[PDB]
Design a protein around this ligand. Structure first.
Ligand SMILES: Nc1ncnc2c1ncn2[C@@H]1O[C@H](COP(=O)(O)OP(=O)(O)OP(=O)(O)O)[C@H]2OC3(O[C@H]21)C([N+](=O)[O-])=CC(=[N+]([O-])O)C=C3[N+](=O)[O-]
Ligand SMILES: Nc1ncnc2c1ncn2[C@@H]1O[C@H](COP(=O)(O)OP(=O)(O)OP(=O)(O)O)[C@H]2OC3(O[C@H]21)C([N+](=O)[O-])=CC(=[N+]([O-])O)C=C3[N+](=O)[O-]
Ligand SMILES: Nc1ncnc2c1ncn2[C@@H]1O[C@H](COP(=O)(O)OP(=O)(O)OP(=O)(O)O)[C@H]2OC3(O[C@H]21)C([N+](=O)[O-])=CC(=[N+]([O-])O)C=C3[N+](=O)[O-]
Ligand SMILES: *[C@@H]1O[C@H](CO)[C@@H](O)[C@H](O)[C@H]1NC(C)=O
Ligand SMILES: *[C@@H]1O[C@H](CO)[C@@H](O)[C@H](O)[C@H]1NC(C)=O
Ligand SMILES: *[C@@H]1O[C@H](CO)[C@@H](O)[C@H](O)[C@H]1NC(C)=O
Ligand SMILES: *[C@@H]1O[C@H](CO)[C@@H](O)[C@H](O)[C@H]1NC(C)=O
Ligand SMILES: *[C@@H]1O[C@H](CO)[C@@H](O)[C@H](O)[C@H]1NC(C)=O
Ligand SMILES: *[C@@H]1O[C@H](CO)[C@@H](O)[C@H](O)[C@H]1NC(C)=O
Ligand SMILES: *[C@@H]1O[C@H](CO)[C@@H](O)[C@H](O)[C@H]1NC(C)=O
Ligand SMILES: *[C@@H]1O[C@H](CO)[C@@H](O)[C@H](O)[C@H]1NC(C)=O
Ligand SMILES: *[C@@H]1O[C@H](CO)[C@@H](O)[C@H](O)[C@H]1NC(C)=O
Ligand SMILES: [Mg+2]
Ligand SMILES: [Mg+2]
Ligand SMILES: [Mg+2]
Ligand code: NA
Lengths: 318, 318, 318
């Protein structure tokens, strides 16, 4: 009967269309390269005021070289003119009543205990220690550099998909609305401008610059390179997203080492709180390939061939 | 004959069970994301004694920012108060008999030869050089900071599988037996505590803290995120492993730059030996997908369909 | 007719050979690990002359620890003995006629404007600023350290394919023609020597050491680990390539902080131009697997089964 082939032909049309659209949607004919090879060069620009000091890129940015992870220092604690010696620790956790509770068995690790219980002040009695004196008092409150919100981060990112040897950069003057020197990334108005406003990045990550600068934190500027290398070079485009990674705070210690004319050594101990920026470059490209196209083909051919049998059994049996 | 279908039905039962278990074991129905996106923040805590000095996190940890690669300095060589000028190199390799063998053709690279053969000491005669004087003597023996074995490394790791947008952290209070502030990673007792004892890490890597601190080395704290994103969020868990990567030693040079009241410059040249720690975050997730499930399906369907024919030929023919 | 099976047998021979060679060529029977886990330790050696100074590894290499990204400083701009205060900016862009155009609305960001229009020199009138004085003059011309071309970069790279737990290093004495201490990488003569001549690396990237050292730049030493883990351990070999990533220049600012006997602070501000080296380790391994071998098998079986039908229709119909 002719209807049998009109039923089978309709079966093949519909089923093959479902299968066809499904496989065509997931790019099942594409080999995928998920090992992007990225290079990131960052440059921060701006100046702020902290205490009665002016902070420039050499004062608050660390490291200086412009790596994928850098820190803009917003608040810091200074302990000036430390020198090796003996002094009573100011931390209450080191409180003692006699030299019998200042032995090595107490607080394993941490500073060096001399073994004497000494009077840091009139209100506290702590174990004496050998080290940089006086000791640090990290419980005080200090200001924060507010101008850091208005600093700009310029991110140059140069990636390459090695499986296809397709390399490209994120400096795209045609895609930017304004000049490169004066543009400013906006997810909607200028999403390809490589210049980011620090405060903007803080907003895109859903963070308050006040609290963040106060406690420090870790934000991620995410550069995504989802690309179809079957399409034009113009189609491989970076997409920027932002996130807070510590989800607290972020601080680190470093000293400025000075020496006296008589040769003795003394440092300025600095506890730095700031916003660390981690440029995280993800990317995956898909290029047409014979092998995935053949495997997907056999899959769709056989799958339709079974679906028509099952549909005949489900339809005819009913 | 009915037995023919009882033979075929048994064929399908057994063969389909083998195939079924095989494909089900390898998660052939899963798409895999092998491009983990990790952020690592490390913090070292402890204090040691070297010479008649006390070393704190600001003295032996470099860099200070808490990156994925950092160095705990255990031994160092100091050459204090160097100044630009001329002096005889102390390295024997520069030995000379006359100014005729101190020309640019000799030892290309390395220091700057003035062209004069001068007497470094009474027992050695070396080419004179222009540079930081006096020259370094890197053949002496120095102590090592033993307290560095008892230092603790706290590793905060925040990763994300972008193909599935599944992000998670390694701070898991429910998985840790003890408090986060006081716990200590143990592969068996507390394998999810983010606080690692330096000496412990040295043991897990099969290394002697004595020899390692003496010669320096490169160890890797490996964080693995093998996850089945078909299962619960609770099931995606990090697994820590450890390894020595240099498999010798590790050292680097840096100077402390001082200036005189009259303006002349002089530095303290420091050759640092320590234990560099590289946090290596691997991970791959598998989530159910229609495409891999269909491809594997067709594969198992056809494979059984051929195995039954071949088994009929092998069985019936015999 | 026997010819029908001689036609079919020839069909299967030819078609199956095409399919067979195609699938065998792309290693369709292999699972692939594209998430290499690499560790990179770099060491630069050499000395240069800049001004009347001698630069050693402690002077021009930054950072010192030997990471995968480092910088060899070739040219720099020094602004010595800066101190917080007020002074007229030397940048023409800050030119003013009266204090009415030195308000916060002008040049948002950048230095701190006091609000006064002052005379930097007799030929220029600029807004006065609070900060490190005097201000920097980054428009002068300075020499470049030519010896940096002859420096050597030693790259120790230790990678691991985690999916197969196959770890290996790039120090291969058997593959190197000369001794490790004296060899020198040459793409043809010694392509496995880990010691690279800076000038050589500059040539392999198609760059002029003169212009590059003058303006600075970003080069990439690419280490590729394409490996067939079905073959011998000896067959997994690294291949080095080179590229310029900025495709201008590269510079960064850092200061040397000094303190006076009376306690006031003053720094030497340094703008550094150099060649940043980024070690980019790519790699992917392929190991025989049952699942990819079965999927490819079904694909080739079915594909031949359809090609023979289509070829019968194309041949017989004609
Ligand atoms: N907020 C910002 N506003 C303006 N410029 C900013 C900003 N942040 C970073 N930059 C960098 O500043 C460089 C131009 O400097 P410019 O502001 O005109 O002059 P300055 O006198 O202030 O100092 P400079 O030229 O940086 O030494 C560009 O170099 C690069 O990135 C730009 C660059 N570029 O934009 O062309 C490409 C590049 N690579 O690698 O392709 C590297 C740069 N870099 O490292 O600065
Ligand atoms: N051996 C160690 N013992 C105790 N604390 C240690 C140790 N190593 C590192 N830390 C970090 O120390 C922080 C708590 O400091 P705590 O010891 O209580 O106070 P201190 O007065 O000694 O100095 P501090 O608070 O660090 O400035 C925590 O912050 C963090 O990691 C912890 C942390 N945390 O544990 O909650 C989360 C975090 N991120 O990003 O989520 C970053 C930290 N960090 O950078 O230190
Ligand atoms: N152009 C170069 N010529 C000669 N040696 C150079 C050069 N660049 C770097 N190096 C490193 O120099 C080390 C040997 O030093 P050597 O030149 O003999 O002695 P020096 O007195 O000059 O100073 P040093 O031993 O480095 O403190 C080796 O250590 C290592 O890499 C080698 C090394 N190695 O070559 O055996 C293995 C290693 N890891 O991790 O396996 C790390 C090294 N490293 O960090 O220097
Ligand atoms: C950032 O720039 C805006 C623009 O004029 C300014 O109003 C604001 O005060 C600046 N932020 C700080 C902290 O000075
Ligand atoms: C950028 O714009 C110019 C227009 O002058 C065009 O010729 C060029 O092809 C464009 N490049 C890309 C990558 O779009
Ligand atoms: C160097 O002088 C300072 C005070 O100027 C003093 O505290 C120190 O003890 C002196 N050096 C030595 C080794 O005594
Ligand atoms: C490390 O801690 C243990 C615990 O008391 C102590 O016995 C040992 O001396 C410490 N190590 C060093 C080098 O002091
Ligand atoms: C952690 O423990 C609490 C128990 O108070 C539980 O409610 C929570 O769901 C747990 N979270 C995870 C991720 O296991
Ligand atoms: C500065 O003084 C030191 C000794 O105090 C001396 O060696 C040096 O020559 C002086 N500076 C100059 C430029 O001579
Ligand atoms: C590099 O080495 C060669 C080899 O002798 C030498 O001729 C050349 O002058 C050196 N380069 C510089 C900048 O000195
Ligand atoms: C290196 O050479 C030696 C020859 O003495 C040989 O025994 C060894 O197997 C070789 N190793 C490799 C990895 O080729
Ligand atoms: C310290 O001395 C310098 C000159 O030697 C001077 O400029 C400065 O004002 C002095 N310190 C203070 C706080 O005045
Ligand atoms: Mg304290
Ligand atoms: Mg020497
Ligand atoms: Mg300027
Ligand atoms: Na298939």
């Amino acid at each position: 009967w002719t209807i049998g082939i009109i039923n089978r032909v309709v079966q093949l049309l519909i089923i093959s269309y479902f299968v066809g659209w499904v496989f065509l949607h997931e790019k099942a004919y594409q080999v995928r390269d998920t090992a992007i090879e990225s290079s990131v060069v960052t440059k921060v620009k701006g100046s702020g005021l902290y205490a009665n000091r002016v902070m420039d890129v050499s004062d608050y940015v660390t490291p200086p070289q412009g790596t994928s992870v850098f820190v803009i220092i917003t608040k810091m604690i200074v302990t000036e003119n430390q020198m090796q010696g003996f002094c009573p620790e100011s931390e209450e956790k080191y409180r003692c009543v006699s030299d019998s509770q200042c032995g090595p068995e107490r607080l394993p690790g941490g500073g060096i205990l001399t073994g004497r219980c000494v009077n840091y002040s009139s209100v506290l009695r702590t174990c004496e220690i050998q080290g940089w004196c006086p000791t640090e008092v990290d419980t005080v409150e200090t200001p924060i550099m507010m101008e850091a919100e208005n600093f700009t981060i310029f991110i140059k990112n140069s990636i390459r998909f090695p499986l296809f040897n397709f390399e490209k950069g994120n400096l795209l003057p045609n895609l930017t609305a304004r000049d490169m020197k004066t543009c400013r990334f906006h997810p909607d108005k200028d999403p390809f401008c490589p210049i980011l406003r620090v405060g903007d990045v803080v907003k895109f990550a859903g963070q308050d610059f006040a609290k963040l600068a106060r406690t420090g934190g870790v934000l991620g500027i995410k550069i995504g390179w989802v690309c179809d290398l079957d399409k034009a070079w113009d189609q491989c485009i970076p997409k920027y997203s932002f996130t807070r990674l510590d989800s607290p705070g972020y601080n680190f210690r470093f000293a400025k080492y000075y020496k006296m004319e008589n040769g003795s050594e003394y440092r300025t101990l600095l506890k730095a709180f700031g916003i660390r920026f981690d440029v995280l470059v993800y990317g995956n490209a898909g290029k047409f390939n014979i092998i995935p196209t053949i495997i997907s083909s056999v899959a769709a051919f056989t799958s339709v061939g079974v679906g028509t049998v099952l549909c005949d059994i489900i339809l005819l049996n009913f």
